[PDB]
């Protein structure tokens, strides 16, 4: 059996959000969670590259324009929130050089939050 | 005004899914398209780091069992959706070596697919 519906027909929307590739990012939260001198370029040798990270900015799904269809925005709270991964950096933080997980945000899901504190 | 809730306080699951780090990452799709060969490792000079790489599998959403709590599995197709991301590979297709995006899956997220196809 081959499930080509529920996995590529379809749909596979509900909150949009746009991911910019910035060279800049000078600082960024390593995976034990210090913000770590991240610079924004690799130094190899004596040629340095500037690594294309990724600034995710959530947007106001449009696809369903008020909230989450599904979701009660009334019981629940329908919030877009931004999925972070662990990209791999040339930080100068200890000893000379390492290549460590800074993280990035690189989507923006909805999700029904729960509702307990105003 | 400061929204603690609705974006710290509250909940933010629904499908849950594991990202295994892998450095045997010999092969991966790049932005444009075209499975490149990733190796898996780094070479700097005469130093080669495998690159930790996430293989995220899906898991069948615990916090609400069946689906997806909000989602009408009989009207829409709750399905959890692999978010997958542009990671920066040193591959060597192509002159010499170049240091392009590659996609790797790094999340799992519920979205509402749209029946049409069965």
Request: with cysteine.
């Given at each position: 059996s081959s499930?080509?519906?529920i996995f590529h027909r379809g749909e596979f929307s509900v909150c949009d959000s746009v991911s910019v590739w910035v060279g800049?990012?000078?600082?960024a939260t390593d995976i034990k969670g210090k913000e770590v001198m991240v610079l924004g370029e690799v130094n190899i040798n004596n040629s340095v590259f500037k690594q294309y990270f990724?600034?995710?900015?959530?947007?106001?799904?449009?696809?369903?324009?008020?909230?989450?269809?599904?979701?009660?925005?009334?019981?629940?709270?329908?919030?877009?929130?931004?999925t972070?991964?662990?990209?791999?950096?040339?930080?100068?933080?200890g000893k000379q050089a390492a290549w460590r997980f800074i993280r990035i945000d690189t989507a923006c899901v909805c999700v029904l939050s729960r509702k307990a504190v105003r």
């Amino acid at each position: 059996s081959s499930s080509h519906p529920i996995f590529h027909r379809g749909e596979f929307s509900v909150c949009d959000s746009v991911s910019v590739w910035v060279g800049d990012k000078t600082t960024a939260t390593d995976i034990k969670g210090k913000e770590v001198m991240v610079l924004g370029e690799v130094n190899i040798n004596n040629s340095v590259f500037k690594q294309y990270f990724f600034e995710t900015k959530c947007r106001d799904p449009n696809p369903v324009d008020s909230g989450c269809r599904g979701i009660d925005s009334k019981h629940w709270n329908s919030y877009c929130t931004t999925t972070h991964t662990f990209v791999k950096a040339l930080t100068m933080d200890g000893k000379q050089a390492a290549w460590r997980f800074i993280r990035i945000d690189t989507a923006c899901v909805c999700v029904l939050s729960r509702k307990a504190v105003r």
